[PDB]
Design an enzyme around this catalytic site. Structure first.
Site: not given
Ligand code: ZN
Ligand code: ZN
Ligand SMILES: *[C@@H]1O[C@H](CO)[C@@H](O[C@@H]2O[C@H](CO)[C@@H](O[C@@H]3O[C@H](CO[C@H]4O[C@H](CO)[C@@H](O)[C@H](O)[C@@H]4O)[C@@H](O)[C@H](O[C@H]4O[C@H](CO)[C@@H](O)[C@H](O)[C@@H]4O)[C@@H]3O)[C@H](O)[C@H]2NC(C)=O)[C@H](O)[C@H]1NC(C)=O
Ligand SMILES: *[C@@H]1O[C@H](CO)[C@@H](O[C@@H]2O[C@H](CO)[C@@H](O[C@@H]3O[C@H](CO[C@H]4O[C@H](CO)[C@@H](O)[C@H](O)[C@@H]4O)[C@@H](O)[C@H](O[C@H]4O[C@H](CO)[C@@H](O)[C@H](O)[C@@H]4O)[C@@H]3O)[C@H](O)[C@H]2NC(C)=O)[C@H](O)[C@H]1NC(C)=O
Ligand SMILES: *[C@@H]1O[C@H](CO)[C@@H](O[C@@H]2O[C@H](CO)[C@@H](O[C@@H]3O[C@H](CO)[C@@H](O)[C@H](O)[C@@H]3O)[C@H](O)[C@H]2NC(C)=O)[C@H](O)[C@H]1NC(C)=O
Ligand SMILES: *[C@@H]1O[C@H](CO)[C@@H](O[C@@H]2O[C@H](CO)[C@@H](O[C@@H]3O[C@H](CO)[C@@H](O)[C@H](O)[C@@H]3O)[C@H](O)[C@H]2NC(C)=O)[C@H](O)[C@H]1NC(C)=O
Ligand SMILES: *[C@@H]1O[C@H](CO)[C@@H](O[C@@H]2O[C@H](CO)[C@@H](O[C@@H]3O[C@H](CO)[C@@H](O)[C@H](O)[C@@H]3O)[C@H](O)[C@H]2NC(C)=O)[C@H](O)[C@H]1NC(C)=O
Ligand SMILES: *[C@@H]1O[C@H](CO)[C@@H](O[C@@H]2O[C@H](CO)[C@@H](O[C@@H]3O[C@H](CO)[C@@H](O)[C@H](O)[C@@H]3O)[C@H](O)[C@H]2NC(C)=O)[C@H](O)[C@H]1NC(C)=O
Ligand SMILES: *[C@@H]1O[C@H](CO)[C@@H](O[C@@H]2O[C@H](CO)[C@@H](O[C@@H]3O[C@H](CO)[C@@H](O)[C@H](O)[C@@H]3O)[C@H](O)[C@H]2NC(C)=O)[C@H](O)[C@H]1NC(C)=O
Ligand SMILES: *[C@@H]1O[C@H](CO)[C@@H](O[C@@H]2O[C@H](CO)[C@@H](O[C@@H]3O[C@H](CO)[C@@H](O)[C@H](O)[C@@H]3O)[C@H](O)[C@H]2NC(C)=O)[C@H](O)[C@H]1NC(C)=O
Ligand SMILES: *[C@@H]1O[C@H](CO)[C@@H](O[C@@H]2O[C@H](CO)[C@@H](O)[C@H](O)[C@H]2NC(C)=O)[C@H](O)[C@H]1NC(C)=O
Ligand SMILES: *[C@@H]1O[C@H](CO)[C@@H](O[C@@H]2O[C@H](CO)[C@@H](O)[C@H](O)[C@H]2NC(C)=O)[C@H](O)[C@H]1NC(C)=O
Ligand SMILES: *[C@@H]1O[C@H](CO)[C@@H](O[C@@H]2O[C@H](CO)[C@@H](O)[C@H](O)[C@H]2NC(C)=O)[C@H](O)[C@H]1NC(C)=O
Ligand SMILES: *[C@@H]1O[C@H](CO)[C@@H](O[C@@H]2O[C@H](CO)[C@@H](O)[C@H](O)[C@H]2NC(C)=O)[C@H](O)[C@H]1NC(C)=O
Ligand code: NAG
Ligand code: NAG
Ligand code: CA
Ligand code: CA
Ligand code: CL
Ligand code: CL
Ligand code: ZN
Ligand code: ZN
Lengths: 696, 696
Positions: B370, B574, B612, B635
């Site tokens: 991460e 608009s 769903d 998104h």
């Molecule tokens: Zn972290």
């Molecule tokens: Zn971190």
């Protein structure tokens, strides 16, 4: 009993005939008033037939029309600038239609305007290999020349793209009798051949799945923001116009320069088929001049959308769709298909009035502006994409019901092969000599599979019809069926009167299907497929059939690459990952099939999990990033050929990376891209397989 | 009884404490052996806790590490080329860890190598507005200068991007005590402040959701085809290195040139905060030299994936995920979150051993890498995208459980607002002064909504954590929760010891949460959300809450545009279509809610249709074409800010089209793009609304 037999028995040849007549008395050109009135008629009738709702869905899309007061034509001009020969301004109308108004004259839809003058180069079918032959072998330069090409073999839009990239300044398309005059058959009205004054209309876009040229990705609704023409998708850069073979003979007869390279370049007219450039000595100062004044304009179109709500799974859609717009009368294309849809709706509605509903929802569509680029189907799918990708079970197309009268033609996803085999075994053959035998039997006898004894030919889906958005963009299992000519003698350019004024009700009634029995057989196939898809408890898809074809396609693409063994060694090009994925798919599909056979049949959740696994299997072949420079062709297994929109190509990303690779200046880069495409394909196949694994 | 109360009561503060200690004794840097061993431990323990399967999913991704025998540092150099001041080679280790091996020295992950020499420009926080101020107002040119920027306010990757585009040849990042030294609190080990030798590690990529830099779109599996470094996604072009404030003072104290433009440019060190360029008269020939020798290399990472199969809907996934890799000991980030996940797994497993299963499947994830760009979560989601988009109910993140000890912080989709309000009303407050009161009550009192009396603050999801792929790429309803500091005094740069060697078990146990009561409260919130999402018969999402926020966001973006009334008149800009779509969404959502309340509760198909419809509602906000030049931010309502990855922006496509628009040279083009973005947003909102209409 309300079962498939009841549905099928209600279908009548005589009703299809009546509807065909009704739909073909006047032209229904997209964006014209007559085609809006027909939309409103079909809406009304589908409501009376018993559908739950029937609505019009409209869009404002780019269309193209000739200028009524400034006609398109082509000349031969002498050095003084006198026009000594002009092509025709219209096709001679057929008997009894010589007073019909609003017959659009022959033109190439979306041609830009211009009056280019120059020397003619003859380019055969204007295929990629034809241009390779001219430039690479014959050393003929098309730059700044007007090219003349015969129709046939490939979609006309690909011809135009190929001529542009060769530097042509205009394109003349014509119908050669070699390709549009069947030996031994009379010209219309006395038979089904193309007369010398007949001309094939048709659009020349290269949209690659985009839909309306101005709104790629989004529906062309009331607030849509449009691209400027200069940024529109798929428009040709050079003027284009189609002619018949009387006129073509006059343009070709004076051609000089190089001889045709071989006999595959010669059609059937009494001319040398010299390649050019330009005319022979005595006429060398004469030139060809085009005059194109057509205009592109944003115009309203109308789809009719009918709904028959499902009793059990109303959120699962089975779609039967085909178009309504025609070039002129649409006697075959599309009204032979539209009349079949009309009778299918009527028959379903009869059952509905007796209290029946299908298990899943059935949607019926009458699409507009198919002839101008699949515009109506694509805009609607763009609008409803979220509904379609989460709820779309299957799409069955319904354009022309006939292109011949010899046997059945089916093109579809492998997921439908078993469904089609089983249905056709329960249907009666309409063919002479097969009275009392099944359609499966006649079809298999006349059109044998090239792979498997005792099975019929089923082709890949290509494109050039309204299934494209559903299959190649959205990944919804799709199919089509019609009657066709003998595959053995088929030269793959369609029927002679394609997109001509001569395609009438009388053509069909006199020469193709006087008893409407082939139409009825096609209604039974299309309708029966829809019935099974919308009513079978377990969706009628067999994943194992995809496994078989994926291996065949992997073998094929490997074989192509293996023409380059040195490069595969140098660049360490391996197909092992793709074969591994296909092996895994085969194993996982077999295990899924066992569970599908064995699962607890009383458990509706396990059933729906397995129906969702079946529905989302086609969906798994979609790559959200699309294919290279073709973002709306997202299916990794199947795309329309980059050289011919009508033809399907398998593993298209790898195929295009390999195509003509020996000509690329940087082989390291080119073979890197081959490897990249192999990785994408292997990954997608494995990911699709994993959707059929146990879910947790 | 096996209900939520049973699950919640089984969670123990003392277990979280034991797990935190266990996870923080040695470093667990991504791609190192120690972090593989921890992966294997967590796999083993989750199996013993009772999960049905627990597997490792590995990938080979680009990581970055300093060179152990060629350290990174920064100098001041005189005109002779003597290095008269050097920054530190390591942070002084904390008490009792002075013999711990394998503490990675401070560095900026993914910096290129180089030894640039030059004059220093001080750029405040290196925000877009800071560079606007330098270039446009102060007329200071950063081209070919080394910039020095204070950490804080925005993600450090955006600072680096902004410095590159200004023409900087290197970036020095430092922690100012204004931002990382809380008044009245002692430096570690005697309190929770950053010492002058402390340094914040962290990556400086601009990935925009891509995942591994070498494999955008596809998992970095064994056969993956990688981009070359030159085509990798998101790598910085100039060397970057972080320092502490003792060292920063030595670089800043000699700065000359222009004075700071105002007091918002001055931090808390005893220096003028002159902008430069370069040093004052006596030192004007001295320069700053960076020495960066870090290397990027493809390295294996390991996710742990645990499954607890659902009893009724095993093909519906509720995911609880958080990362395991740390910069050094990870006392807060991430192990305060990982220990909470561990105890949640244990508690669910206890119920499972007694015969219980959740209704839907629960997936538990221990993500790797991460810290190097959300690599582990993104590669796994890329691999499993088809499963996730058709089956993914919700994702709950589980990184740091604490960033303060004052009150709750929740950032989530509107679809979870009601779920969070209802759950927190059933949980006990851990806060002093709120004994016997609900968490809802304490939270609402300490962190009031800025809009609604009697409600708590809930923020938009931004990014910079492992939910990004799930929410902004795939459109799966996502949320996060943790304990935090007072919003009223929050300067929005996080806790002082962020990503430093000082972030230890002792930090947490002595200064944040000695009784592990805030950890337990966060376990109850995260776990309780997962429980409800995986076990509620009807999914616990309220579509009406999205309707309310969509109106708020439409009002906001309209207000931004209305700063340009002349241009809105000239270009006919608009917002009516967007307000129309939001009105329709509001009406349709209200009607859906009525049906959800009223539908026949005995009908599991109607329930699943409505489950769903609820699951695919977040999904409907995805545009498969992505946002402009950010294809993995799909998104339409929410994207990470283009100026700050940590911050969420609403209607990002329109926001970015409007940003600094008065500076664009072609206003016609710029306002055209605003209109295009309005069309895309209105269309998407209407399309999402239509997914909640009756299905047929
Ligand atoms: Zn972290
Ligand atoms: Zn971190
Ligand atoms: C068709 O389906 C099969 C499975 O039925 C897939 O098989 C996998 O194939 C990959 C190779 O692409 C195998 O990858 C190898 O995994 C080893 C670790 O595997 C164990 O541990 C993992 C957890 O990380 C478990 O999931 C797994 O079950 C095993 O217990 C690695 O150690 C291997 O890497 C080493 O060797 C390679 C090759 O020489 C080197 O490049 C590396 O540097 C390293 O030394 C390797 O990554 C995987 O184990 C197989 N899974 C199985 C048998 O379950 C096929 O991948 C699939 N085809 C496609 C196209 O997807
Ligand atoms: C919020 O939800 C409402 C519905 O509750 C939507 O309303 C639609 O709004 C559009 C405008 O964007 C309307 O479009 C108009 O349709 C007329 C035809 O409508 C009838 O026939 C159709 C079949 O084609 C039926 O579906 C429909 O129910 C009606 O029976 C056209 O004639 C209009 O075009 C004419 O006027 C415009 C504007 O001046 C001109 O530009 C044209 O040139 C032309 O002269 C127009 O296209 C639509 O009817 C409305 N549907 C309704 C009320 O059901 C909103 O669109 C929706 N908001 C968003 C953002 O989607
Ligand atoms: C194709 O078939 C359709 C449907 O049968 C034909 O349209 C129908 O035509 C009839 C006769 O014109 C219409 O009925 C008439 O209505 C008006 C009053 O509204 C009245 O003046 C007449 O006495 C008669 O009742 C009918 O409405 C119409 N139906 C629909 C649904 O459009 C059409 O004429 C056929 N076309 C061809 C070329 O054969
Ligand atoms: C092919 O079609 C073209 C275009 O219709 C024909 O050329 C056109 O011929 C007309 C009639 O002769 C010309 O109009 C006349 O021009 C003269 C001289 O300016 C003027 O005296 C007349 O009053 C009249 O305006 C017209 O200019 C000419 N147009 C072009 C573009 O060349 C041509 O005759 C046709 N060829 C054949 C073989 O049919
Ligand atoms: C097309 O028709 C064929 C032939 O009827 C269908 O295959 C057959 O499907 C049935 C399921 O209805 C299979 O029956 C099963 O037999 C096994 C014992 O081997 C048992 O475990 C099950 O309880 C069930 O009775 C039958 O074996 C199978 N025959 C084959 C493959 O030769 C096929 O499903 C149809 N395709 C469709 C509907 O797409
Ligand atoms: C964090 O907690 C884990 C789990 O309790 C600790 O790992 C566990 O450590 C024990 C003691 O080293 C391992 O048991 C030993 O196994 C070997 C034979 O396999 C034997 O020689 C010993 O007598 C003893 O039975 C145990 O396997 C191991 N468990 C796992 C799942 O890894 C770990 O030591 C703790 N770390 C810290 C820093 O406290
Ligand atoms: C900051 O760190 C740098 C790099 O470690 C220090 O500069 C380096 O100082 C060493 C030791 O004096 C130099 O090595 C020596 O070079 C001389 C002359 O060639 C030779 O006679 C010795 O045997 C030895 O090799 C080294 O060249 C020099 N490196 C660089 C890149 O300048 C510097 O002293 C440190 N500054 C402070 C204030 O601590
Ligand atoms: C959060 O908690 C609130 C308060 O309990 C939940 O709203 C309530 O949901 C129930 C359904 O369990 C609603 O009950 C219904 O009442 C109507 C009569 O008005 C009746 O038609 C139904 O048969 C049913 O008994 C209740 O009205 C509603 N209360 C509100 C909105 O104030 C809410 O659903 C919870 N949110 C979740 C689970 O995400
Ligand atoms: C179609 O062609 C006609 C006829 O040549 C065009 O109408 C002429 O337009 C010009 C200026 O654009 C006028 O000065 C002429 O008087 C018009 N002639 C007639 C006979 O009306 C018309 O512009 C073309 N239509 C298009 C481009 O849509
Ligand atoms: C085909 O013909 C064209 C034009 O007669 C050639 O293009 C010219 O050659 C170079 C570009 O390669 C330029 O100097 C000229 O400006 C081009 N002319 C024009 C009008 O575009 C083209 O290279 C020829 N191709 C061959 C011989 O293979
Ligand atoms: C890390 O830095 C070291 C030390 O400067 C590099 O190792 C040297 O590499 C050169 C050639 O590349 C050799 O001639 C030296 O003898 C090596 N020195 C030592 C002390 O081993 C090493 O290349 C760097 N590591 C990287 C780039 O990964
Ligand atoms: C900031 O400084 C740089 C370099 O000192 C300026 O870039 C030079 O100016 C033009 C390009 O606009 C070129 O002729 C030179 O080649 C550029 N030099 C270098 C080294 O790149 C830049 O324009 C300055 N910006 C200002 C004054 O706004
Ligand atoms: C239709 O079938 C007959 C044989 O019954 C054949 O002679 C005729 O040419 C066919 N028509 C077409 C258009 O192929
Ligand atoms: C933890 O809470 C106490 C009040 O109980 C406060 O004095 C202390 O500073 C807080 N710790 C942190 C790190 O904010
Ligand atoms: Ca469109
Ligand atoms: Ca990747
Ligand atoms: Cl068809
Ligand atoms: Cl978090
Ligand atoms: Zn057609
Ligand atoms: Zn057609």
């Amino acid at each position: 009993k309300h079962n498939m037999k009841a549905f099928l028995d209600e279908l009548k040849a005589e009703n299809i005939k009546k509807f065909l007549y009704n739909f073909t008395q006047i032209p229904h050109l997209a964006g014209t008033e007559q085609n809006f009135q027909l939309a409103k008629q079909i809406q009304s009738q589908w409501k009376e037939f018993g559908l739950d709702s029937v609505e019009l869905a409209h869009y404002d899309v780019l269309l193209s029309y000739p200028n009524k007061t400034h006609p398109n034509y082509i000349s031969i001009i002498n050095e003084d600038g006198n026009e000594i020969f002009n092509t025709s301004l219209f096709e001679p109308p057929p008997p009894g239609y010589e007073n019909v108004s609003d017959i659009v004259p022959p033109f190439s839809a979306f041609s830009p305007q211009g009056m280019p003058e120059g020397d003619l180069v003859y380019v055969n079918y204007a295929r990629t290999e034809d241009f390779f032959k001219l430039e690479r072998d014959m050393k003929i330069n098309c730059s700044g020349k007007i090219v003349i090409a015969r129709y046939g073999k490939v979609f006309r839009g690909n011809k135009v793209k190929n001529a542009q990239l060769a530097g042509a300044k205009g394109v003349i398309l014509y119908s050669d009798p070699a390709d549009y005059f069947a030996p031994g058959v009379k010209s219309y009205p006395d038979g089904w051949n193309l007369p010398g004054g007949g001309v094939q209309r048709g659009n020349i876009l290269n949209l690659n799945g985009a839909g309306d040229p101005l709104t790629p990705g989004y529906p062309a609704n009331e607030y849509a923001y449009r691209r400027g023409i200069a940024e529109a998708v798929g428009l040709p850069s050079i003027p284009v116009h189609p002619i018949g073979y009387y006129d073509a003979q006059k343009l070709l007869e004076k051609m000089g320069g190089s001889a045709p390279p071989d006999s595959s370049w010669r059609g059937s007219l009494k001319v040398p088929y010299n390649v050019g450039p330009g005319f022979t000595g005595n006429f060398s100062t004469q030139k060809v001049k085009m005059h194109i004044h057509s205009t592109n304009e944003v115009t309203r179109i109308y789809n009719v959308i009918g709904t028959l709500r499902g009793a059990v799974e109303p959120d699962r859609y089975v779609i039967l769709g085909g178009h309504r717009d025609s070039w002129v009368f649409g006697g075959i294309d599309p009204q032979s298909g539209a009349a079949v849809v009309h009778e299918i709706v009527r028959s379903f509605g009869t059952l509905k009035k007796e209290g029946w509903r299908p298990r899943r929802t059935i949607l019926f569509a009458s699409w507009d502006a198919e002839e101008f680029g699949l515009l109506g189907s694509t805009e609607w799918a763009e609008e409803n994409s979220r509904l379609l990708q989460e709820r779309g079970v299957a799409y069955i197309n319904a354009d022309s019901s006939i292109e011949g009268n010899y046997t059945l033609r089916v093109d579809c996803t492998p997921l439908m092969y078993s469904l089609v085999h089983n249905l056709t075994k329960e249907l009666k053959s309409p063919d002479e000599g097969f009275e009392g035998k099944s359609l499966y039997e006649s079809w298999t006898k006349k059109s044998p599979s090239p792979e498997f004894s005792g099975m019929p030919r089923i082709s890949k889906l290509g494109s050039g019809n309204d299934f494209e958005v559903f299959f190649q963009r959205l990944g919804i299992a799709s199919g089509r069926a019609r009657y066709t000519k003998n595959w053995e003698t088929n030269k793959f350019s369609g029927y002679p009167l394609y997109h001509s004024v001569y395609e009438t009700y009388e053509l069909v009634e006199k020469f193709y299907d006087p008893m409407f029995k082939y139409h009825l057989t096609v209604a039974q196939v299309r309708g029966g497929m829809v019935f099974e898809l919308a009513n079978s408890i377990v969706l009628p898809f067999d994943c194992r059939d995809y496994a078989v074809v994926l291996r065949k396609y992997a073998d094929k693409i490997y074989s192509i690459s293996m023409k380059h063994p040195q490069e595969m060694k140098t660049y360490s090009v391996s197909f092992d990952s793709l074969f591994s994925a296909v092996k895994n798919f085969t194993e996982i599909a077999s295990k899924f099939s066992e569970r599908l056979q064995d699962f607890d049949k009383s458990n509706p959740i396990v059933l729906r999990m397995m129906n969702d696994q079946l529905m989302f299997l086609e969906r798994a072949f979609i790559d959200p990033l699309g294919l290279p420079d073709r973002p709306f062709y997202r299916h990794v297994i199947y795309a329309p050929s980059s050289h011919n929109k009508y033809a399907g190509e398998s593993f298209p990303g790898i195929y295009d990376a390999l195509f003509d690779i020996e000509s690329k200046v940087d082989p390291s880069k080119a073979w890197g891209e081959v490897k990249r495409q192999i990785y994408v394909a292997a990954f997608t196949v494995q990911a699709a397989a994993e959707t059929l694994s146990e879910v947790a």
